[PDB]
Symmetry: C3
Subunit: 331 residues, 3 copies
Amino acid sequence: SVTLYGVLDAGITYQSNVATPSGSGKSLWSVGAGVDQSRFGLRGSEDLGGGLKAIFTLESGFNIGNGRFNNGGGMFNRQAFVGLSSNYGTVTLGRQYDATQDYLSPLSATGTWGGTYFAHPLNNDRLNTNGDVAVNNTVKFTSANYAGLQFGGTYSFSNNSQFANNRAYSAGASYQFQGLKVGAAYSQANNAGANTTGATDPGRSRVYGAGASYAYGPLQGGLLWTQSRLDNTIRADNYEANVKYNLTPALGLGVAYTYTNAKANGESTHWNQVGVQADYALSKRTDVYAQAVYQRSSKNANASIYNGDLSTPFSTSINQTAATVGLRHRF
Amino acid sequence: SVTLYGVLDAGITYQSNVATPSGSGKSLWSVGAGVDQSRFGLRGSEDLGGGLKAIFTLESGFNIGNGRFNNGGGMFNRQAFVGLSSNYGTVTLGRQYDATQDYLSPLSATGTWGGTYFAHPLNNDRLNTNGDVAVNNTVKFTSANYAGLQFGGTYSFSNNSQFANNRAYSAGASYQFQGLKVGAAYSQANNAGANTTGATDPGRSRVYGAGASYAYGPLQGGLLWTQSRLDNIRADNYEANVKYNLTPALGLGVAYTYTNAKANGESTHWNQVGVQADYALSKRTDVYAQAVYQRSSKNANASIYNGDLSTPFSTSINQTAATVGLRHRF
Amino acid sequence: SVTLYGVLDAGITYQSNVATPSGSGKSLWSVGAGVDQSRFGLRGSEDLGGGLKAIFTLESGFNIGNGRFNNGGGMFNRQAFVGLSSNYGTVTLGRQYDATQDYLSPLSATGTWGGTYFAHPLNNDRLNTNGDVAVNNTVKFTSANYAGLQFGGTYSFSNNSQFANNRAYSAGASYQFQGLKVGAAYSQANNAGANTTGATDPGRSRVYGAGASYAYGPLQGGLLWTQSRLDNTIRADNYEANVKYNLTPALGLGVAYTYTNAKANGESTHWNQVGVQADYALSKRTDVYAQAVYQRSSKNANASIYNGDLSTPFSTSINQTAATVGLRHRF
């Protein structure tokens, strides 16, 4: 039947250099989501019989600092879908995440233990869900396990009289074998953000990616490459390596490094980001975390560690550092 | 006690001719609510004793396509009321539907099996609830069953220093006898939509209606007439509907509505017909398929109500709407 | 585990003189919250063991008249916090009420049986919660009972590159001894309401207060003084006395009177407000109430009984009276 769930993440974050309305740059202290975005949701599954089940998920994301909605402000701004699931496959209709989150995000640190501040610059590949990365009016298929091989795709309508006014589609697959995990996916959007009725909330946007991860005992490591492109021209490539080791069953330590190269009108911009996180689990539901991330950029641009808000100003320097200590609770 | 409930309706809908910002008109494909508006809510009843019970309903409507609120965007945009219920009657305070939804809507196809696209042109009679048809700041009384005879009324404040800035009131009754069901109601609004504090969310508006329905076995039929008036435009709606249950799990429905309107002394005509097939996978989950056709007079255009009044008209006098969808209850 | 709760308050209210867009003033009849603001929420507490428990509260306020959010419109506009609680103290992070609501509000009639219309003029001391009195990005500590002595403090971040751009902090204490209860608190805000990222949702604001209350049998009485100050210049002092007598265990009668003296640019304004309330409890969850409030001001200003909305226009005269009859239900 119906199940209520949620995760609450509240912590204090210090950012070293955030630009001011005046030309200067000052340190920013904030109370908000550190790793995961605070959310609450409803999920259910009704056994219709004959191997068929009706399924639904309604998930709403909010900021525990101010209590407001994020991801645009709708009711169920993260996920809202219903569909039928069989042993053949699952088809779901509604506001959902595309294949890049289904198959690429599990390989990245921002999609696992790292969360927000371990995201790639400006979340250009849309890997982290502490942002409006879901697409509206989406039809999604997810295949069966097929011996660890799972593939799926999504197609998103614009709900406007113009077909390509806000269309999006994606496809991906992943294979898991013991500790080894491999995945790849692709997503495309057409005129993303034009109208309110379309898939991408307010040219041609594309994301490519492939990566792998291995987990032997307490040690888990992974490497991933992603590319985000915008045409009709900006292009960016992200190269990430991440490692998490569980010293204690309750204590895990994670390190990640990302190099980002971007082509904005044919000239190169570079980002190098490194971050460390220690998380201690007080229980299955509650844990405490602490993390520090460092990013320095090339001299032709500035540094910005993604803090969940794209509107946050860049650093005045090529230097920015972010440190967070927080509490995370599930129910 | 308190109960969480909800209905999820997701389907793909095709409209034949929806106008574009440019003069041309194009077909529109959308993923959203086909029959019923997706909603979730909390309902409760506490037995206070002595035949008295406290009741409340908080109901929020949203679109599963984008996850956003409808009906203006408030939290509980469909219904939000509390009140006391006794064997004499029930009084409730809050954002509620008027008598036309209480007594006329059960007779219409748009209020039963048809839903959104089976509504009369532009939902002029306010029969369909896939829109902002509730009224704010409403006092409502509903009588006892009295041998199948139930009557009720509503009174709605403006919550502004001008009383008639957004006043509304309604009254209606319905009688049910074996297969026969009969109902009639009246609703009036004064300066509807003027201020944000008033009953109708952003002259003198009135709605009339009376109809009847009969249900023998798998065959259920009904016919209804409604009239909507605007003062300080006039429209009459004539509807006939039938639903037959081929299989206990499979139902077929057909409906036809003719609408005649007098706007500044000029007559406008609409004829709307629709067919729907629904199969019940369970008590909670079903799948449906439907097709609707509407033709207008050449002095105007056709528009099948799709739940959004801002949706542009057809460029032609012809419009067609087709939907296939999934509906789940929890 | 997690618990869903809520309060529904619906009543009809009559105000004698509310200003109109045209110079005239007309009587206003409204359907809305009489005493308490309608709300729903989720609360939970997980026993982490060893005397430590994780706790959270997510509370949303709405108006049953229109179904809309109040207190700015966010999801959890009243309270949204998570924290850890031990026998030493409790620390919580998120959108919370400051010390003035923790320790001063219980002494006032507006914070107990009176509610909205028993609030001081313009709710200047922020004692009533039928308004946006919570502060964002707040770290709060609440001490143990210490033999009826409870003290606490709050600190609220600006979440902007400027530290004091929308900063707030508060501190307070309360002592309870049999029937007698005494409390005092202090709150300060810097540039309240400037930016969206700060503590107070859209100069220098401070509130002081101290009071005491006694309850012997069915007779309950209290007296309280508060001062609210605004610079960059207004200052106001409120003197309140309140009495509640329970004729029947289910029937209570309440009377309250407040005198307010204000300094606006060096000129004095006077308010005298009197109100009476009778409430009959149909059960522990359901009760019915009736109340009438009268306020008179000096001729250099106007009268306005706080109706939960600060934007409500004043009376055209120095005279205003407010009467409400309503139903209040808990779940």
